[PDB]
Each structure stands twice: as C-alpha cells, then as structure tokens.
Amino acid sequence: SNAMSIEKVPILGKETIHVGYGIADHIVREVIANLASSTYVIVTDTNMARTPQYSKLTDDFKTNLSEKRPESRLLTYCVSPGENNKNRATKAAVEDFLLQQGCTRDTVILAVGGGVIGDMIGFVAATFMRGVRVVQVPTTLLAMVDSSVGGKTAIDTPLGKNFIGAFHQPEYVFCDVSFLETLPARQFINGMAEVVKTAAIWNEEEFTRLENFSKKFLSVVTSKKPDLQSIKAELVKTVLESVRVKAGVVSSDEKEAGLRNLLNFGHTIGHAIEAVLTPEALHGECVSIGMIKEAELSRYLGILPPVAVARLSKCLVAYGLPVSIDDKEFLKKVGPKRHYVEIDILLKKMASKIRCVLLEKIGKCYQLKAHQVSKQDLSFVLT
Amino acid sequence: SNAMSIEKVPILGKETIHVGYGIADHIVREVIANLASSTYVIVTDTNMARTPQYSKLTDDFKTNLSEKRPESRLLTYCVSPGENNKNRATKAAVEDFLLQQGCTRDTVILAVGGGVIGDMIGFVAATFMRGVRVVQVPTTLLAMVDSSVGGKTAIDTPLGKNFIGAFHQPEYVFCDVSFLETLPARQFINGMAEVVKTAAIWNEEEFTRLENFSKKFLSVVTSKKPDLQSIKAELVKTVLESVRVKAGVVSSDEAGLRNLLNFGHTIGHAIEAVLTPEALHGECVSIGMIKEAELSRYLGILPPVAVARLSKCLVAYGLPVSIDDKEFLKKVGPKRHYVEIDILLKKMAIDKKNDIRCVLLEKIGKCYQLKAHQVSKQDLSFVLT
Numbered sequence: 001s002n003a004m005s006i007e008k009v010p011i012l013g014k015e016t017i018h019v020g021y022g023i024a025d026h027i028v029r030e031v032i033a034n035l036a037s038s039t040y041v042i043v044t045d046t047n048m049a050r051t052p053q054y055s056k057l058t059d060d061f062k063t064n065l066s067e068k069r070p071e072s073r074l075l076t077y078c079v080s081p082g083e084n085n086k087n088r089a090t091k092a093a094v095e096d097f098l099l100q101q102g103c104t105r106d107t108v109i110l111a112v113g114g115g116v117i118g119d120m121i122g123f124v125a126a127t128f129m130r131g132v133r134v135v136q137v138p139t140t141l142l143a144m145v146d147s148s149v150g151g152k153t154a155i156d157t158p159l160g161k162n163f164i165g166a167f168h169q170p171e172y173v174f175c176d177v178s179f180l181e182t183l184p185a186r187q188f189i190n191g192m193a194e195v196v197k198t199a200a201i202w203n204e205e206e207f208t209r210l211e212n213f214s215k216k217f218l219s220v221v222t223s224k225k226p227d228l229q230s231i232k233a234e235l236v237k238t239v240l241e242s243v244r245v246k247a248g249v250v251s252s253d254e255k256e257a258g259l260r261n262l263l264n265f266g267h268t269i270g271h272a273i274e275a276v277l278t279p280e281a282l283h284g285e286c287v288s289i290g291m292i293k294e295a296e297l298s299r300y301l302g303i304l305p306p307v308a309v310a311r312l313s314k315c316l317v318a319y320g321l322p323v324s325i326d327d328k329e330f331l332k333k334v335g336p337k338r339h340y341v342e343i344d345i346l347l348k349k350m351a352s353k354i355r356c357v358l359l360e361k362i363g364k365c366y367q368l369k370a371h372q373v374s375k376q377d378l379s380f381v382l383t
Numbered sequence: 384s385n386a387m388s389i390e391k392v393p394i395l396g397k398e399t400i401h402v403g404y405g406i407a408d409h410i411v412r413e414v415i416a417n418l419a420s421s422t423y424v425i426v427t428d429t430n431m432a433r434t435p436q437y438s439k440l441t442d443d444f445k446t447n448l449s450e451k452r453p454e455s456r457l458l459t460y461c462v463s464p465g466e467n468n469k470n471r472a473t474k475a476a477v478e479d480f481l482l483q484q485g486c487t488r489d490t491v492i493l494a495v496g497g498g499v500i501g502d503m504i505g506f507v508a509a510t511f512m513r514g515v516r517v518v519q520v521p522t523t524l525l526a527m528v529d530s531s532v533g534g535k536t537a538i539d540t541p542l543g544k545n546f547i548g549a550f551h552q553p554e555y556v557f558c559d560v561s562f563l564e565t566l567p568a569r570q571f572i573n574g575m576a577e578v579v580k581t582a583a584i585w586n587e588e589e590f591t592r593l594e595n596f597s598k599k600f601l602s603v604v605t606s607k608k609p610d611l612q613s614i615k616a617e618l619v620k621t622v623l624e625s626v627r628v629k630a631g632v633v634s635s636d637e638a639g640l641r642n643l644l645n646f647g648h649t650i651g652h653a654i655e656a657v658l659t660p661e662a663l664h665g666e667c668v669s670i671g672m673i674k675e676a677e678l679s680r681y682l683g684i685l686p687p688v689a690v691a692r693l694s695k696c697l698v699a700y701g702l703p704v705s706i707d708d709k710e711f712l713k714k715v716g717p718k719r720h721y722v723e724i725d726i727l728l729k730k731m732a733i734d735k736k737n738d739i740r741c742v743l744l745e746k747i748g749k750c751y752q753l754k755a756h757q758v759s760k761q762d763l764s765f766v767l768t
C-alpha cells in the first residue's frame with residue numbers, strides 16, 4: 001500500500017513472505033542482515049538477466065554486501081530460459097558452478113525468476129551439501145502467488161514433469177510486483193487463473209474486488225507499453241490476497257490436514273487437460289477451464305448454485321482466460337491437438353473414484369475438503 | 384530364521400535396525416508386512432548380483448510376495464560397482480528405470496550393497512517423486528556398522544565426494560552378516576577401522592572383546608577358504624556392538640556427541656585425499672586414529688598406554704598404524720611421497736571451511752568432555768612431523 005511499502009504474510013508462524021512494488025533495496029537488506037553467510041548466490045535465466053529490475057537487485061546486493069559484510073562474496077549465474085531447460089543437466093551445471101566456487105553449507109541462494117527457476121534452483125538448494133538456505137524471488141504472477149510458496153521443488157525428465165525433487169522450505173519469499181513490468185501479456189493473464197482460484201475457494205470479498213478491477217487490469221496488461229505504476233496498489237493487493245490464501249492453507253494443513261487439497265480447485269480436470277494440450281496450452285489457461293468444469297460438477301451434484309457457475313465464468317472471461325476447450329482463441333493456441341481431448345484419456349489422466357474440490361459458493365468449498373466422485377459423474381460434465 | 388535369530392537396535396526410539404546371520408527370509412517378511420506397496424525394487428551392483436546370498440534374498444522376496452501380495456510386483460535393477468559409478472549418470476539411470484516401469488510414490492526400494500549403493504540408492508529414494516521409502520541392506524562390514532545408519536545419502540561429482548545428497552532416514556536397516564561370506568579380505572579388514580573406532584570412543588568392554596577375538600578373526604578372514612560360520616556369533620556381536628554406538632549417537636537430542644563418530648577421520652580424511660584410490664578409507668582412518676590418539680596424549684589428556692593398546696588392536700585386525708607400514712607402502716606406491724604436513728593441514732582446513740576440530744580420546748572407551756575440541760595447526764604439525 002501507500003501506507004506500507006512492504007506487506008507480510010505468515011507461513012507456519014513466521015512472516016517470511018514479503019510483498020511490495022520496487023523493493024530490491026529491502027530484499028537485499030533483509031537477506032544480508034538475517035541470513036549471515038560467506039557466500040550469496042543469485043541464480044536467474046537469460047530473459048530475467050536482461051531486465052532493468054534484475055540489474056537493480058544485483059547492484060543493490062553488491063553495494064550493501066560490500067558495506068555490511070566485507071569478507072562475504074556475491075556470485076551470480078545464469079541458465080537458459082524455458083521448461084525444456086528444467087532438467088538434470090541444468091541442475092548439474094548450477095551445482096558444478098557452486099562447487100568450482102567453493103560454496104559450502106553456509107551458502108545462501110536466491111532464485112530470481114518464474115516457477116521454472118523457483119522449482120529448479122529450489123531443488124539445487126535442497127540437495128547442495130544436503131541442503132542450504134534458499135530465498136525465492138518470483139518474477140511471474142503465477143510464481144508470486146503460487147509456485148514460490150510451499151516448498152515443492154523439482155525438475156523434469158523426458159518421461160514427465162516434476163518427477164525428481166524435494167520438499168525444501170524457503171527462508172524467505174519476496175514478491176516484488178515491479179518485475180511484472182517486463183512480463184509478456186499472455187503469462188500475466190495465465191497467472192490470474194490461480195488468483196481467481198484462491199478468491200473462489202476462500203475469499204468472496206476479494207473475488208468482488210477482482211471483478212471490479214478486471215477491466216482496468218486487462219486494459220493495462222494488453223496495451224502496447226503497459227503502464228503498471230498506474231495500477232500499482234491494486235496489483236500489490238492482488239498478489240497479497242492470493243498468496244495469503246496459499247500460505248494460510250499450507251500453515252493450517254498442519255492442524256486440519258486435507259485443507260491443503262482445496263488449493264487443487266480446477267487442477268483435477270485442468271491437469272488432465274494440460275497433460276493432453278501442453279505446451280500449446282499454458283497451465284493457467286487449463287486451470288481456468290478446469291475450475292468451470294469442476295464447478296459444473298459441483299452444480300450437477302446439487303451443491304454449487306448455477307448462478308455461482310455463471311459468476312465464476314464471467315470473472316475468468318473478464319481477465320482474458322478461456323472457460324471451455326472450445327473457446328475461439330484457445331482453439332487457435334492448441335490447433336491440431338484439440339481433437340486429442342477425448343473423455344477416456346481425461347478419466348485416465350485423473351486416475352477408481354476421483355478426488356475433486358466441490359465448490360459450495362463463491363468464497364467457500366463444500367465441507368472444507370476434497371471429495372471422491374465417480375467416473376460416471378465426471379463423464380456427465382465432460383460429455 | 385525366527386525371533387531368536389534377530390538382534391534389534393533402536394534409532395529415534397524405534398527398532399528399525401535388525402542384525403543377524405542368514406536372515407533373508409526375515410528381511411522379506413518384515414518389508415512385505417510393514418511396508419505395504421504395489422511395487423518393491425531391489426537395486427544392487429554387478430559384484431553382489433552374482434553371489435548366492437543375493438539370489439537367496441531375491442528368490443525369497445519373489446516367492447513370498449506372490450503369496451502374500453499377489454497384485455504387487457518385484458523389480459530388480461543393477462548398476463556397475465566402483466566409486467567411479469557413484470555419480471549423477473547412475474542416479475539418473477536408476478530413476479529412468481523406475482519411471483519407465485511406472486513406479487509411483489508407494490514404491491519401496493531396497494539398496495543391497497556396500498556404502499556406494501547405500502548412499503547412492505538412498506539418494507535416489509530421497510528425491511524420487513520427492514521421496515519414497517528406502518530399506519538399507521548393507522553388504523560390507525563398513526556399511527553394516529556405519530554407512531547404512533543415519534540417513535546421510537549422496538553421490539560424487541568430479542570436484543569431490545558426497546557433495547550432492549539428502550538426509551533421508553531409511554525405514555529399516557537389515558544387517559545380514561552372511562553377506563560377508565563373499566567380501567574380499569581387504570574390504571573385510573577395511574571395515575574393522577570403524578568397529579575399532581566405536582569401541583574406542585564408547586565401549587571399553589567391547590574393545591576388550593575385540594582384542595580377545597582379533598587373532599581368530601584375522602586367521603579366518605585371511606585364509607584361502609574362509610569359514611565364517613565357525614565365528615558366526617562373534618561376528619554378529621562385532622556388527623551389533625559397533626552399530627549400537629552409531630545408532631545411540633544418531634538418536635541423541637546432547638548435540639556434540641555426533642562429532643565423536645569423527646574419531647580418526649580428521650587426520651584420516653586428509654591422508655585419504657592424498658592416497659585415494661590406492662588406499663582405502665578404513666586403512667587411512669586406522670592411521671588417523673593413531674595420530675589423533677598421539678595428539679590427545681601430546682596435549683596431556685590420553686595416557687601413553689592407550690596409544691600402545693589401540694595400536695596393537697588395530698594391527699591385530701590387519702590394519703596399518705603408520706603411513707610407513709610395509710604392506711601399506713605396497714598398496715600406495717609413489718603416492719606416499721606426496722604425504723607432506725602442509726597438504727594434510729590444507730585438507731583438514733578445507734574440510735572445516737564453513738566452521739580445525741578433533742576428537743580427543745581420554746582413555747579407551749571414553750572421549751574427553753564428550754565433544755570434539757579445537758586444535759592448532761602447530762600441534763597437528765608437531766604430531767605429523
């Protein structure tokens with residue numbers, strides 16, 4: 001906000017998720033002051049490496065470290081971008097760099113990038129000398145609200161995604177919304193799927209604010225040179241209220257286990273679709289369609305009222321997301337893969353009951369847990 | 384085998400370390416009954432794969448599983464032996480096999496082999512879908528008493544050893560002493576360094592037993608046709624009492640006890656870095672224990688008689704007590720001449736670049752103040768010069 005340059009969210013009792021706009025300064029001081037180390041390492045990709053905000057961070061990091069901890073060193077390393085580099089070779093290359101540099105157990109690694117970087121460099125930190133401190137610095141909307149929080153790290157293999165990895169909690173998550181200034185529009189919209197999800201499963205008031213923000217958001221993000229400063233407060237609030245839900249649910253799952261599954265709203269059906277249509281369909285695009293199908297499932301089972309289905313769909317369309325696999329622009333993105341989406345391959349991906357979130361209303365999940373549903377009922381909504 | 388065949392040792396208050404001699408059936412029953420899964424995977428190396436006891440274990444596993452869990456399956460995978468294969472490419476190969484065979488989060492992996500297998504397959508389990516259940520089945524003496532216990536897993540890189548890994552506690556450790564029937568003598572003897580070490584840091588009564596057992600142990604192990612069954616009971620006790628000490632230390636709260644396990648390793652790892660691979664780890668740790676004991680004696684802590692005693696016991700088990708041991712010089716050859724004081728000091732310092740500490744023995748079976756102690760480059764130099 002105007003009144004608070006940094007807003008914090010607790011995770012497992014500690015306020016280590018920090019959100020603001022143009023906070024390189026704060027990131028650097030917080031890290032150096034609280035995570036004492038001989039060696040700090042910023043890891044990024046090529047795309048992020050070229051942006052002005054990235055240079056501001058490393059510059060700020062360099063200067064403060066020179067003042068505060070003269071004996072300590074800052075190191076930087078860049079991987080190539082893309083899901084195709086989220087692999088064993090890249091992990092090994094980052095490690096070989098850390099080892100050549102004589103990094104030890106005290107090393108602090110900052111993962112500056114989207115979910116690819118966050119997951120992969122999180123995993124590097126998880127196994128480096130059997131674990132070193134990592135700080136998540138997410139730079140995509142998706143990564144800011146979802147992937148940076150919860151400690152899930154991984155890489156892909158030629159057989160499938162995120163099959164090798166580790167649970168490794170970050171010391172901090174810093175969401176500097178000003179990084180979104182360079183994010184391509186499609187990726188920005190993709191990220192709103194998780195934002196709408198968190199409001200839909202937990203916060204109707206935020207859902208209302210999102211509806212009221214949609215037109216000016218979509219108008220700025222799709223303009224030629226997006227002016228993000230003009231909607232700065234509203235973007236900070238967007239990231240804040242979504243990550244609050246993710247962090248709250250992760251923390252609450254401690255004592256009320258199974259609340260964590262509510263974060264899967266739209267992912268049961270959406271992951272099944274994305275399995276068929278990746279990489280032409282992005283994850284948020286598939287999650288949006290999934291939330292609608294899953295909402296229709298709750299409706300068909302006599303739980304979600306039909307008006308809430310309509311309200312959810314209106315909000316997703318207003319943020320530029322598809323609400324069925326037959327959406328015209330979505331058909332354009334997926335082309336010849338459209339016809340691969342048959343009911344049978346979807347029921348197979350989702351495997352013989354299936355677990356699914358059943359929305360009760362906007363802002364609330366039915367009985368605060370996931371439910372086992374039959375293949376017959378899922379077939380009905382997918383027919 | 385039955386209940387009478389098995390000695391258990393607790394780790395963090397649960398009896399998951401089981402020791403016996405000829406216990407493949409027990410291993411099978413215990414895993415299948417306690418670790419319910421669709422898929423059990425036994426991973427080993429070429430050398431172990433061809434031994435009779437390995438086949439006994441896998442045959443028994445197959446038979447019992449198809450009876451008790453007919454819808455489950457047993458898979459097997461074999462890697463090449465050697466520290467040179469304790470690497471990323473092998474870890475990936477094992478993972479690709481698992482994935483190609485459709486293994487999921489319920490998979491139970493058994494690591495049947497020495498410490499290379501234990502550490503590497505342990506690490507495969509640690510990261511597979513972010514972690515699956517692993518069972519350590521150590522087959523060297525060293526692995527039965529030390530490496531299988533404590534949850535440390537790793538592989539090596541060209542820049543050094545055990546740098547990439549994970550802490551991943553095994554569901555069970557099964558030490559079947561019958562695997563030692565096919566262990567080459569040099570490796571069998573190598574394992575005795577850690578056995579002597581555990582007795583020396585913690586259990587003077589066991590040290591006495593090991594002294595009394597030494598002549599017999601060595602004549603059996605170094606014969607042409609070793610008959611291990613004739614010393615069965617005493618070998619089981621040997622394993623049991625060393626792994627007891629490791630497990631008790633791992634189970635502590637009283638942090639600082641963990642460092643007592645490093646007795647012999649401060650100087651020993653430095654010697655090994657210069658002399659590997661011609662010298663084995665336990666051979667260097669033996670020498671290391673002697674020098675660290677001399678250090679404690681020099682500092683006025685350890686009485687001289689302890690150094691004599693330790694030295695006699697180590698040699699009676701076929702281990703060297705100096706870098707100029709006749710047989711040790713044959714193994715290492717021209718690398719001996721690179722063991723200078725400055726490179727040892729450099730390595731001991733590199734090993735503590737995060738944080739030079741050393742265990743100081745107070746007498747046989749007791750460490751001074753139950754913790755490691757900072758020692759100077761001068762005093763180490765004095766003892767190594």
Ligand SMILES: NC(=O)c1ccc[n+]([C@@H]2O[C@H](COP(=O)([O-])OP(=O)(O)OC[C@H]3O[C@@H](n4cnc5c(N)ncnc54)[C@H](O)[C@@H]3O)[C@@H](O)[C@H]2O)c1
Nearest residue numbers: 047081114115116117139140142143147152179180182183
């Ligand atoms: N850990 C979890 O629980 C979790 C949850 C959801 C997704 N994920 C993971 O997240 C990954 C997808 O992440 P993503 O959607 O952030 O994609 P991404 O990291 O692939 O980034 C998308 C593209 O944007 C570039 N980029 C990132 N930030 C930028 C910025 N500020 N300006 C300009 N360009 C930028 C990247 O170089 C890349 O080309 C997947 O691999 C998925 O497995 C993880």
Ligand SMILES: NC(=O)c1ccc[n+]([C@@H]2O[C@H](COP(=O)([O-])OP(=O)(O)OC[C@H]3O[C@@H](n4cnc5c(N)ncnc54)[C@H](O)[C@@H]3O)[C@@H](O)[C@H]2O)c1
Nearest residue numbers: 430464497498499500522523525526530535562563565566
């Ligand atoms: N995790 C830990 O805390 C820890 C502690 C100490 C050592 N280690 C590790 O242990 C490894 C060394 O283990 P090791 O000393 O068991 O060596 P190893 O695993 O290399 O085995 C030695 C040799 O014996 C063969 N072999 C093993 N058991 C056999 C048997 N019963 N019959 C016939 N052949 C057999 C192997 O194929 C190999 O050729 C090192 O890589 C080291 O990093 C780990």
Ligand SMILES: [Cl-]
Nearest residue numbers: 127164510547
């Ligand atoms: Cl790995």
